[PDB]
Amino acid sequence: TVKEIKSLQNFNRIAGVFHLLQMLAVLALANDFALPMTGTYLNGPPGTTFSAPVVILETPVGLAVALFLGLSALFHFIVSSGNFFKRYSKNQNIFRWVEYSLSSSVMIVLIAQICGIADIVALLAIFGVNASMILFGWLQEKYTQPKDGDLLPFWFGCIAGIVPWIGLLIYVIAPGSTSDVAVPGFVYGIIISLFLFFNSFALVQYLQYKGKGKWSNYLRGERAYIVLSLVAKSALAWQIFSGTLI
Template sequence: MARTTRTPDDRIRRLRPYNLVAGSLHLVQAIGFGVILAMLDTQVTFGVTADYLAGPPGFPLPPERVDLFAVNVGAGVVLFLALSALFHFAVASPVFFPRYGAGLRANRNYFRWVEYALSSSVMIWLIAQTTGISDVAALISLFAANAAMIGFGALQEKYEEPGSGNFLPFTLGSLVGLVPWIAILIYFLSPGSTSTVEPPAFVYGIIISLFLFFNTFAINQWLQYRQVGPWSDYLFGERVYITLSLIAKTALAWQVFSGAIIPALTG
């Protein structure tokens, strides 16, 4: 049987239902998580704090710690999934699909980068808080560093062509993107801590898993711009991005959400 050859326009049209499927699955999970949260008697929240000077700079006085607000981790995961669903539905809508298709023909998808800048930065905030980072300045900085990493990914797509061999925006983005994970690793390992409490062994696996799932999107772009195998076709890479949105984001959401509801169920 002869293999059907589809034109680029045909393949772009086929991405429309795939985006609808991805958006629907994210939305179903977001609603499901929201229902579970509503059924819980207690919620897992992490405080966001600020340490203000309590005396002249340089004096060994303990700072004044202020609790600014609290973040509901479960609600944060719902927001993460809802943002993903919103953008999948947006690019499949009659309003934005023509622009989405035109961008793909030019090897670009700016919708993707806007969504990633928001949703992945929400996720890095949540992961940071689960390891004990609570300072508002630190959390804002990690959020911004992650968003900047995504911005460099967008610049790679805007100014470089796949196969050109130029990776300056990608490289700079990778370096910036490591900063939040270095901070998370420091808090996770707790060097200098006198506490005898150690995280269970499975928590180490979760942190490694979160890191790997989080960075599969960067690997996909690297393969796309290196023109490795089927990634030499930009539309193949776009389909992989949507697949990763289904698999990697779901795995991230479930791992962080389970960390939010298990203490509430067992506490």
């Protein structure tokens, strides 16, 4: 109903306000914590020798955390004018796909650096393939309705989506570890929680397109997504905050 549409304008505006408040809070309180992006270039032939790692760029973590919070705050304020409905008049939500393409990619990169993924190409590619996951979900919503035909776009998203995490799992397990590799307790919590949040985002899409009575109303799904952006970003933002100090 349009009455639900109206509640969504108010709902988004509040979601944005919470993201905005936390963004400012982090900006006020966070220290100057930075993580490295490096390159290990060749000293010659491909399989002969490598030049020692050079730090190309560093990531100001507090600003980066504020950044993905800022992206949600911003997009919710844009949406609050009723534009997402104006783009309907099932529904489709491009605003969300653009927002997530940016913010979920910003934050998966943070998680990687936290694990120890320093290489600049790795972090770039992870950002790219995470964006692909979001863009596949967008294509699901663009070309199909809640019917059998939505399978592929979704599952292509799952393929692009699962990879980043597999990379993290490699570093968490550390196949080449020589016993001096310790992963912090707060890191393990960040990975698990955020992984479980990413799974629920996939779950919303699935159920929404599967068509379960409850989720036959697109707007229940829309609202559930908005909460997940809010809860998952908050969770990571304050876990990293606490962990930076720990």
